[PDB]
Design a protein around this ligand. Structure first.
Ligand code: AKG
Ligand code: AKG
Ligand code: NI
Ligand code: NI
Lengths: 230, 238
């Protein structure tokens, strides 16, 4: 497939002019790979620091509002039931501001310098945790802000469609199409829609331009951190 | 739950930042207790460690919690629980029984907390190595009691939150304390008949407040009762 480009610590100017302004995706290397989270986060570290904390957990496909659901449980309960022993069902600790809830963890991360290129102020950047077993899947969708998706534990497969291709994406903000199991009959335009893809690995940051369409499956036990900014 | 009448008892002397040399010659060598003022009062823990701060950072960690008084081995016991469950059951609202997060090396367990304290300069006067210093947390509701006892090293007990009534007896007074090392005597309710030699034994005492450091010389007998919700840090050094 066509792969998202990878750059080691590109200047602020180059990032702005070649990716930010024109809305082109890119993977940034050498930027987050030495944040303390990269060496510190593990099942055991997370359980030790945050195991007792209460967090929202998704179960089900996020294609339709009616198709998924969240329940509150401790981090230990979530790891026990959905990661370790020995998951029948798929649970995802997704889209949760864990780092406002647990300021100890926020110390293990950092706000990417590139964020200073936007209009908004730093305090207004939304930082979400995405913590889950191999096999979690976020259906194709778009978000209203710029995004730096930081991979911390494990790898994700990520597929990206320009907003220029919204039409071939048979929306309902979220696509009706199962990106990895599409129905060629029900949505013909899809299969020839062009895209970029990647396997996002620890230390790596994917820049997802505002409104850019993205699909995401965790290949391993996974932990990512997104920064929604403007 | 009564603030004792300390101005009627001999008080431990208080000094503001005595010099190392004065501390060495007049307190360490002869083994005399003293309260050091103006040394720890600006440690970050002094402003930082509210009850809510401690719960936020440390809440999930498992910690040993003592129940019962330590007058003999069989009279007390420890339960391992989270800091949250300790605070919940033994600190907040109206707890029925007394629990004490006592004598626990919380600072090796949660190293970030080390940034909020320091090794007192005076420790460099000992023979030991800085790494060999043992730092313990003592976190408990109003009313915890540590019975009269001695420890085998020098001690700087730093008060961070709340106050403690402390009574001290020199090693030369052991006879009048009826050791079983620990004493059989309940300092604040002594049995005069069973322990006749206790009433006249000489002692120093104090109410130790936040920011203050109590120097307990090696083997000096000490008894401690928390007057409020309390948090102390001890440095056992040699
Ligand atoms: O990582 C995922 O599973 C979804 C990420 C995402 O949609 C986002 O960060 O905006
Ligand atoms: O703070 C207490 O209750 C006891 C302190 C103590 O015995 C010590 O630090 O040696
Ligand atoms: Ni998204
Ligand atoms: Ni002691």
């Amino acid at each position: 497939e066509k792969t998202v480009p990878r750059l080691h610590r590109p200047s602020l100017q180059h990032f702005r002019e070649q990716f930010l302004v024109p809305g082109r995706p890119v993977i940034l290397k050498g930027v987050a790979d030495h944040w303390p989270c990269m060496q510190k986060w593990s099942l055991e570290y997370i359980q030790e620091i945050a195991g007792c904390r209460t967090v929202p957990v998704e179960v089900g496909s996020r294609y339709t509002d009616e198709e998924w659901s969240q329940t509150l449980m401790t981090v230990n309960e979530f790891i026990s039931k959905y990661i370790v022993n020995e998951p029948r069902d798929v649970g995802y600790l997704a889209q949760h501001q864990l780092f406002d809830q647990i300021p100890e963890l926020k110390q293990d991360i950092s706000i990417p310098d590139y964020c200073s290129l936007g209009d908004g102020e730093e305090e207004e950047i939304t930082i979400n945790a995405w913590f889950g077993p191999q096999g979690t899947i976020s259906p194709l969708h778009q978000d209203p802000q710029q995004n730096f998706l930081v991979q911390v534990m494990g790898r994700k497969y990520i597929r990206l469609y320009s907003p220029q291709e919204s039409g071939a994406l048979y929306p309902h903000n979220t696509s009706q199409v199962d990106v990895e199991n599409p129905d060629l009959e029900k949505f013909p335009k899809f299969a020839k829609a062009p895209f970029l893809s990647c396997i996002l690995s620890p230390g790596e940051i994917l820049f997802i331009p505002v409104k850019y369409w993205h699909y995401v499956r965790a290949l391993d036990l996974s932990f990512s951190v997104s920064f929604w900014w403007s």
